[PDB]
Amino acid sequence: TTALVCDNGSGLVKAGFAGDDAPRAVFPSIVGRPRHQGVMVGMGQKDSYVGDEAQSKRGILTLKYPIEHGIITNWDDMEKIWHHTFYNELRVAPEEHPTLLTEAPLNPKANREKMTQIMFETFNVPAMYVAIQAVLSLYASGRTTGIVLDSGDGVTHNVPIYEGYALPHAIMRLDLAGRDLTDYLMKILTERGYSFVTTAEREIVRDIKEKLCYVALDFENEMATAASSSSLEKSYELPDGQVITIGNERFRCPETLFQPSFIGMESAGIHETTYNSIMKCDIDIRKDLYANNVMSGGTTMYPGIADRMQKEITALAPSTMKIKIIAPPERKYSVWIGGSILASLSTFQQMWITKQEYDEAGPSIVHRKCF
Amino acid sequence: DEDETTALVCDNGSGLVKAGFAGDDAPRAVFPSIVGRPRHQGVMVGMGQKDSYVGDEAQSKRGILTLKYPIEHGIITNWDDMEKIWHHTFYNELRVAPEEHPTLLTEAPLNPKANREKMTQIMFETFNVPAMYVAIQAVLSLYASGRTTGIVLDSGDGVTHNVPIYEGYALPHAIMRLDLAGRDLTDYLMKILTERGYSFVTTAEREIVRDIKEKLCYVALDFENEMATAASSSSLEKSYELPDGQVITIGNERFRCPETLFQPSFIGMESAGIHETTYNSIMKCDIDIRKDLYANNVMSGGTTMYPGIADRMQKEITALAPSTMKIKIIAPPERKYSVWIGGSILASLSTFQQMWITKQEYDEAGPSIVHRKCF
Amino acid sequence: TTALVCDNGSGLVKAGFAGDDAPRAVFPSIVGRPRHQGVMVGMGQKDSYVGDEAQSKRGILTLKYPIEHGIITNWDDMEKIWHHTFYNELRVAPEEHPTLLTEAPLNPKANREKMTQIMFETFNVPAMYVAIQAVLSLYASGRTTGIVLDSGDGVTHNVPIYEGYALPHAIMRLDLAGRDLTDYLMKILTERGYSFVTTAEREIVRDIKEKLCYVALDFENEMATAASSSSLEKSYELPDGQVITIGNERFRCPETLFQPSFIGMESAGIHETTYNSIMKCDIDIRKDLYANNVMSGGTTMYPGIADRMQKEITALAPSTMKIKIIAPPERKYSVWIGGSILASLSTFQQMWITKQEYDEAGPSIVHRKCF
Amino acid sequence: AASELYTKFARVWIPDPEEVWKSAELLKDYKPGDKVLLLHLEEGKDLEYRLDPKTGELPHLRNPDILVGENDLTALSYLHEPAVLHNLRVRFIDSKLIYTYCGIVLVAINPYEQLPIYGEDIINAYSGQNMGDMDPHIFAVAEEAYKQMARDERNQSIIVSGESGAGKTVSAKYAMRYFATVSGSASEANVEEKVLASNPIMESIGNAKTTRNDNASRFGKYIEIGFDKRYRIIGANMRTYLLEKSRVVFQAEEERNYHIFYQLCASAKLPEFKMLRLGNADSFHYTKQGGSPMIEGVDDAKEMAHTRQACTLLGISESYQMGIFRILAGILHLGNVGFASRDSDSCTIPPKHEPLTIFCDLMGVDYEEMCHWLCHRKLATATETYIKPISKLQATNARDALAKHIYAKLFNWIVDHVNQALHSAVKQHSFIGVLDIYGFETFEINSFEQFCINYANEKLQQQFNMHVFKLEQEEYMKEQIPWTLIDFYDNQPCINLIESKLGILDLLDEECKMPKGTDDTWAQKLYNTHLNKCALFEKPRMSNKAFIIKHFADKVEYQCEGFLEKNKDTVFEEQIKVLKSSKFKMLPELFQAAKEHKKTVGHQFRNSLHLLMETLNATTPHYVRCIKPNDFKFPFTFDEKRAVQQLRACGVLETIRISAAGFPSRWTYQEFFSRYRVLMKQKDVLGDRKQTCKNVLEKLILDKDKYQFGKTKIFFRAGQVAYLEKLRADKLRAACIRIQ
Ligand SMILES: Nc1ncnc2c1ncn2[C@@H]1O[C@H](COP(=O)(O)OP(=O)(O)O)[C@@H](O)[C@H]1O
Ligand SMILES: Nc1ncnc2c1ncn2[C@@H]1O[C@H](COP(=O)(O)OP(=O)(O)O)[C@@H](O)[C@H]1O
Ligand SMILES: Nc1ncnc2c1ncn2[C@@H]1O[C@H](COP(=O)(O)OP(=O)(O)O)[C@@H](O)[C@H]1O
Ligand SMILES: Nc1ncnc2c1ncn2[C@@H]1O[C@H](COP(=O)(O)OP(=O)(O)O)[C@@H](O)[C@H]1O
Ligand SMILES: [Mg+2]
Ligand SMILES: [Mg+2]
Ligand SMILES: [Mg+2]
Numbered sequence A, C: 001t002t003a004l005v006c007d008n009g010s011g012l013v014k015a016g017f018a019g020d021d022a023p024r025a026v027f028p029s030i031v032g033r034p035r036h037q038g039v040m041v042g043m044g045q046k047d048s049y050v051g052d053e054a055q056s057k058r059g060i061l062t063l064k065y066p067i068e069h070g071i072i073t074n075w076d077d078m079e080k081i082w083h084h085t086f087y088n089e090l091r092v093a094p095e096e097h098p099t100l101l102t103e104a105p106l107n108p109k110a111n112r113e114k115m116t117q118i119m120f121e122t123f124n125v126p127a128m129y130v131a132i133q134a135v136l137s138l139y140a141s142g143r144t145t146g147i148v149l150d151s152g153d154g155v156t157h158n159v160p161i162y163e164g165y166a167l168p169h170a171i172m173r174l175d176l177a178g179r180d181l182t183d184y185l186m187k188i189l190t191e192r193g194y195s196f197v198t199t200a201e202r203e204i205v206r207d208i209k210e211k212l213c214y215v216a217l218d219f220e221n222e223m224a225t226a227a228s229s230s231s232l233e234k235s236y237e238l239p240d241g242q243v244i245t246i247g248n249e250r251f252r253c254p255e256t257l258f259q260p261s262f263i264g265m266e267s268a269g270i271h272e273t274t275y276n277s278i279m280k281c282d283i284d285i286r287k288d289l290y291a292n293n294v295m296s297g298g299t300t301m302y303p304g305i306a307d308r309m310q311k312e313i314t315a316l317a318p319s320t321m322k323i324k325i326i327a328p329p330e331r332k333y334s335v336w337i338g339g340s341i342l343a344s345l346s347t348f349q350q351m352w353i354t355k356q357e358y359d360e361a362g363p364s365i366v367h368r369k370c371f
Numbered sequence B: 001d002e003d004e005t006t007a008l009v010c011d012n013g014s015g016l017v018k019a020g021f022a023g024d025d026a027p028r029a030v031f032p033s034i035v036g037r038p039r040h041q042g043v044m045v046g047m048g049q050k051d052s053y054v055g056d057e058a059q060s061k062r063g064i065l066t067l068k069y070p071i072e073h074g075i076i077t078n079w080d081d082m083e084k085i086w087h088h089t090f091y092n093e094l095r096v097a098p099e100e101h102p103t104l105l106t107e108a109p110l111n112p113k114a115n116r117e118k119m120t121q122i123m124f125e126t127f128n129v130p131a132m133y134v135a136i137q138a139v140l141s142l143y144a145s146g147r148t149t150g151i152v153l154d155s156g157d158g159v160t161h162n163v164p165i166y167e168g169y170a171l172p173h174a175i176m177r178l179d180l181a182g183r184d185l186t187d188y189l190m191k192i193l194t195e196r197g198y199s200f201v202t203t204a205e206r207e208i209v210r211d212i213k214e215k216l217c218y219v220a221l222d223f224e225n226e227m228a229t230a231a232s233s234s235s236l237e238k239s240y241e242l243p244d245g246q247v248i249t250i251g252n253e254r255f256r257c258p259e260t261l262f263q264p265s266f267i268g269m270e271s272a273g274i275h276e277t278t279y280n281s282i283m284k285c286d287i288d289i290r291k292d293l294y295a296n297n298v299m300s301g302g303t304t305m306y307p308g309i310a311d312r313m314q315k316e317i318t319a320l321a322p323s324t325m326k327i328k329i330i331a332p333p334e335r336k337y338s339v340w341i342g343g344s345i346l347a348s349l350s351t352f353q354q355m356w357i358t359k360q361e362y363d364e365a366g367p368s369i370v371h372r373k374c375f
Numbered sequence D: 001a002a003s004e005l006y007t008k009f010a011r012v013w014i015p016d017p018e019e020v021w022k023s024a025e026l027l028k029d030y031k032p033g034d035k036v037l038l039l040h041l042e043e044g045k046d047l048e049y050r051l052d053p054k055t056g057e058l059p060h061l062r063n064p065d066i067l068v069g070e071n072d073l074t075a076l077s078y079l080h081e082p083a084v085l086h087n088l089r090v091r092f093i094d095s096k097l098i099y100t101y102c103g104i105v106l107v108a109i110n111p112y113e114q115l116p117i118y119g120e121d122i123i124n125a126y127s128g129q130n131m132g133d134m135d136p137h138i139f140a141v142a143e144e145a146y147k148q149m150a151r152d153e154r155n156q157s158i159i160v161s162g163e164s165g166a167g168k169t170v171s172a173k174y175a176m177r178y179f180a181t182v183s184g185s186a187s188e189a190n191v192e193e194k195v196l197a198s199n200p201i202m203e204s205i206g207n208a209k210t211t212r213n214d215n216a217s218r219f220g221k222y223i224e225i226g227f228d229k230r231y232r233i234i235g236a237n238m239r240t241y242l243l244e245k246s247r248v249v250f251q252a253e254e255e256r257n258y259h260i261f262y263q264l265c266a267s268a269k270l271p272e273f274k275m276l277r278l279g280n281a282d283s284f285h286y287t288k289q290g291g292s293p294m295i296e297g298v299d300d301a302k303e304m305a306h307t308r309q310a311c312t313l314l315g316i317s318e319s320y321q322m323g324i325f326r327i328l329a330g331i332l333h334l335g336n337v338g339f340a341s342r343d344s345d346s347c348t349i350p351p352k353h354e355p356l357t358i359f360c361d362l363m364g365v366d367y368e369e370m371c372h373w374l375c376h377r378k379l380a381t382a383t384e385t386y387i388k389p390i391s392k393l394q395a396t397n398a399r400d401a402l403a404k405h406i407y408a409k410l411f412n413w414i415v416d417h418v419n420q421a422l423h424s425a426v427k428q429h430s431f432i433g434v435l436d437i438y439g440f441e442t443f444e445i446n447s448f449e450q451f452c453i454n455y456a457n458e459k460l461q462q463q464f465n466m467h468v469f470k471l472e473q474e475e476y477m478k479e480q481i482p483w484t485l486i487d488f489y490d491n492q493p494c495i496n497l498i499e500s501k502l503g504i505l506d507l508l509d510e511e512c513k514m515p516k517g518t519d520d521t522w523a524q525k526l527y528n529t530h531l532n533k534c535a536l537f538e539k540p541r542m543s544n545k546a547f548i549i550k551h552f553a554d555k556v557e558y559q560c561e562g563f564l565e566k567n568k569d570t571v572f573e574e575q576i577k578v579l580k581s582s583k584f585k586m587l588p589e590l591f592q593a594a595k596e597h598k599k600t601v602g603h604q605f606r607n608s609l610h611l612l613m614e615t616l617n618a619t620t621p622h623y624v625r626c627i628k629p630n631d632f633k634f635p636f637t638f639d640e641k642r643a644v645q646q647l648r649a650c651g652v653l654e655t656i657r658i659s660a661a662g663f664p665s666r667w668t669y670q671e672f673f674s675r676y677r678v679l680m681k682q683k684d685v686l687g688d689r690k691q692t693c694k695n696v697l698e699k700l701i702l703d704k705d706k707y708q709f710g711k712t713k714i715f716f717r718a719g720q721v722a723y724l725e726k727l728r729a730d731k732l733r734a735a736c737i738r739i740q
């Protein structure tokens, strides 16, 4: 049977068959709920909407995320998303296809047990396995040694790996992710007078962010260039047909990854976390991690993030170390691909907790199998 | 002092401007920001209709002229009319020379850089002010409260804002501006009086509805209880005498109108209620300081002058927060007049006399000096 | 004149006069520093806060330790701690009161020299002495023979002593200390859904650690009790009044001392190091060390550590050897008490390095005198 | 050149560890470059004294024994510290001459004894003199000021400047007595009798026992003695100043309160005081803390009889006296009202308390209402006057704030009453102003009052350092007359630290204005502002609530505790309401009287002081510097360390230096041309009046060292103006006889 693979994404869910190089399904995790009143008697009106059919009704609906900070916010809405892929999108049955799931490291034990309980009972899946999102993108990098930095919409984590063996004292996690960069963009656009208040506008700001924002090679140089030349200033057309101006915001927004003091965090910048994790690794494997830094996730997709990261790490590390940054053409599309690769292996077919195993051994079996 | 003339304190109120001298206990001047323009027709042979009227002169001519606000949503709508107000302030009410005296202005946080740079440019170029400072309204309300720690909710006519303050420090992530303010409550009262049968259609009538609002409206302790009481007893129903000498009835509109602060769904907003924004900002603050903000909630600005609002705020925050926390709501008398008083307290300090952007600093450094001194 | 005695404590500094029953001063060494922006005009503010004045402004300031791994991190910050001690807390001049200091063995020569250079110049002390922290707590214990295990916040060390004569080929020093147990607690609480990121939260976790954690007599039995009966589960209210649950973490965190592999540390457990140091001693004195094990320092203050240590050493040692674990009241202050006793001896006042000795003979006189 | 004088047998001044300076007869002649100097000390011992090898600089040379003990230190051949200290030392110990001159300054020494020299034939001795015709005395200073008024119509002032025990109080009294007795030829003797009789009243209500002076004068008093065109006294205006308020409530174990309270206690045996039911001095807080209700060598009942006679001489009715006495007994009865804490922020008083019973009875006030306002307070909000209970500490503060206020109200009444009794004509021709003020003060604790009185002395020394030195040298430079610039202590900085926009009292007023201003926070604000910069101010190492400032005399450490509250000086309205409601008639009169500035003590006082110093500087000034010889208060006991410190704090050495340089008299060329035209010959006068003045002064004074010339002025030494006036009188007389 075609083993199904699914990346549970904080802002964007992806799913498909094992062996495919690309997910068959890719849609927003955000759901929708109407407001105002009943337009007419009946009229095919729904009490809830999912993904693109919620995005087409922005401002009529209130948008809700089933995931925040890597963990599930509402299990009914996550069950709604799972069902939408299985029957409405992929048009298959979970009770016929083994389904691989994946989550962030240092995720609560209760989050995983409840996730597996729903999948094994509500969807009666025949077999199931839970992967860590960071190891899958390193499998797509096709290397056994490499420090992977994975930054999504809702969570961020850095994982040093050597010969296929992670270091559980040196692995890290960061509260800062792409959602906070969107909230920051709204505040720095408010400094011009552009005040936003609804989730309908937040999605247009999230687009503006992905279209126009970039990472500075030297923050001061870009700040002086914006003030002196004004050449970094651009325009953008909103859905009502009005234009708005944007320029300083393009570099200030992504600089938060390196300066979390912008949003008031005491936390260190992404470059520091990767460097400190190498310093927490054994001195013999440090060089090989320096030659194998791996960017992953949608937030790492940013113009100039790799040149700045190389510069920032070269400034901290010894001058004899060959600092190398691997930045896959698609960093968001890498965790799913690793899952599709992993699920295709004949040797991995034993690592699939079965329905019978789960029912006999109880929910804690998933943590005994993974660890 | 003896050897030194005053500095001038002025609050830029959206419906009501207040000004006076540093160290006075109340503003020597308080008048509507409203500017009026003749919307009538030819009547007198020697018609002395002043092109424009200001404050009281405009209020005494409601229906003969139209009423324009120089401020909407915390920001300036027309700078010529704001220059006209500043003129009336220092050349009629206080009747001074602004050329000789330092002047303090004040505005809402999260305000456009342009709305502040243009404000300082006009005051230095057209009023030759020797030195000036731009304060945040919320910090002046906290100074009048007389504490170093408190979460201040400041709701005016044209804007509402919420800034939690711990010790001599601010938290930039917990600042929360709100689009809902006392003007929207007036427009909502007109809608629910229209639902009864009283249709109002002009700024001259809107000012009578704003009076009715401030005289008769109150905040419910439990909305449902007040809805049931109004329907069952009719005891909340009262009468009001309009300027033509006719009477109108009002009762359910007394609690439905202020309830919009706790239920913005009344006007169609997705936005959270005033209690929710204050609570969420405490949860965005550090855990060690949440308790001291929970015991120091501070009400400020003219939209807080509603009967029952402090007791309701307490109940609402006590329902959200852990029951072990001592929820306290500070509501000082004259909440609308607390920002000015705080500006007067600040301006009375001698170590603050050097914190003013001077005419020489402006000329040499250009308008961005205000965002390099105050900001 | 009276002498002063001072314990340079990694996480807690203590000071007082010679011959007193307890230190006059005991406060955190953590030096605070503003990381927030001010808004009140006219407030008594400083660029650096100390001890309880840093703790009373948590979150608003960032907390920095002047000591890590028993070695000074910043000399200016340690100079500000000595300043606060002499003029703000003790209210007496060092220029008149001789000041005994104390540090961990296997500490760099430069750490001792720069410490004594600062004291002899900036504080113009007349006389000074540098003791080893381990011998002082054995003096408080009142024995000439014993194996002292001293575990602080920032360093752990082990010293077999016979008839007042340490065995320098047998002495040990474990990097693992009470700070790592706090970092471990934060990681094992994140699995229960309790994520922490700032030094302000780390101090609340430290309080939770000292209040609720205990050492297991049999680790497996406590895991089985937590899973089967759950009676080990307690609760804790936070500064903001919200409650949190804690149970398995109460025995998992102190168990790291016996199993450093818990985070991923390839060193032997505390019992193994004490046993190996007895094996590095001559057989004739081993029996007397086996009956004179001495617990010392704030990390040994865990409920159930003495009986477990007795069990673990009885399993390693010959069955004929009488295994005894001495674990007095006020174990973290025993080092200070030993220093006071030393500085009161009429036959020790000739061992103090004088300001003259330092000036004429240069900074290395400290090593020549102490050793 | 001076190196030639250090020959064999040349007594000098070697620095002494204990005696400050020791004399040494040279045993050898200093050879050019003799860094070693064999000398012989007066103890009979030889020494090889050594010089500074960077300079070869020699010790101060001793004046010849013939010049020792002179009437003015300018008469010495050598002008230095050892000389001026030694001359004052031998005079006080041997000659008993407590008075010596330093040019314009008269130096005055406390003998700790009556020397009852004074008498009518001494008034006759100084009558008709010129200065220097008779010896140094406050009587000559008073006679000279009187002459200066009588000859030129100018206004005058007498300024005292001494330590808290240096004769400055009674020296000013004897000088005032001089004016009163010289004017005693007039038939209005009772006006001068009232001027004298005002002082024992002011002493009883304003002087008290300190560890420094047993009759320390705790307020200041400038008097303005007015005179007519016959130069006879018409009366005197009193202008009193700041009076201590903590003296009324707190007394140190070695100090006392204002004497009036202890005089009242001694008087309690008479039926008029048995009516006020007055207790003994151990019954009241405001009398008992001093521990000694009687001073040695006095009787408080004798002093009470004196004050009652002085009131009768001032025309103050026994009824007014009895009214003030009832009020003073009322202050004592309030000072021991009982308080019993409740809750924590609450406190009740006994409805049977006897002191409280006689208190409300003597004021004629409702017990219940007095109690209500002593247990509860009114909120400052104008829209809702809601009540708030007060703690035992706040209720104790309300007792003491009320007692302080009532004392002010009655002191201000007395000084207004004496000014009505000392009535004078609507315009005076000319006036002389004697001034007396509290002196420099230190104790083991120093507070806002010490800060104020030391700043007042700082301002007095400042004006002196200007008129005598700074302004004088500027006059010379402006008139372009050959002159050498003078060195002096500029204490104007010790003033800019207090007066300027970031200064101590301005920051004290800010932390009074701010509701979160508080003790540590102000002290820390000073630390944040001034330790980083200024020379004069420091923090002590160990003390963390204290600060130390250098003054003209010496450094004084003020404690930050008790600063903001004494600067605020607030009083409970709820208590002033019931006092204004008193059925006793006196108390309602005492409690009855487009922008504003609200004023603290620090503001109010600095203004009062600027006004005073401007009205002094408008006159022609005279300066006496008072010196204390031993803290032991032992009679005729001269301590060298004590005196050398006092004379360097005043700057006596530099005053002698500038008065030895001479040339204080000045006349414009045209003024000399008009005044001494009778001395000018019709062939010697020219169209250039400058040359005319030069041509005649060349003939009139042969000694070229006594006169100088300026751009538009002519300069002259002491006494030379009196010689020119004697020539003017004699020549006018001869001319009148010649044309007869
Ligand atoms: N080109 C881009 N530029 C900036 N941000 C991007 C870009 N592509 C994706 N992102 C951000 O990455 C997140 C979504 O990427 P993805 O890794 O697929 O999310 P998820 O965590 O839901 O799987 C959002 O925060 C989005 O704004
Ligand atoms: N007693 C009251 N009842 C109701 N609304 C009030 C009352 N007092 C003031 N307001 C409202 O508050 C606003 C004016 O108060 P103020 O704080 O001075 O506003 P601003 O400073 O923004 O001009 C107006 O919307 C006015 O209607
Ligand atoms: N009663 C206790 N229970 C558990 N841990 C404790 C206890 N007392 C101290 N600790 C821990 O031990 C360390 C304190 O050791 P201490 O002797 O104070 O070291 P130092 O004096 O070198 O700073 C810290 O990690 C602290 O959290
Ligand atoms: N010439 C003098 N004749 C008599 N007594 C004198 C004389 N000079 C000083 N005294 C005495 O000196 C003492 C102190 O004088 P006083 O004026 O009180 O000092 P001060 O005001 O400087 O503290 C008094 O007892 C006073 O009688
Ligand atoms: Mg992802
Ligand atoms: Mg307002
Ligand atoms: Mg220790």
Ligand SMILES: [Mg+2]
Pocket: D168, D169, D213, D215, D216, D217
């Ligand atoms: Mg005196």
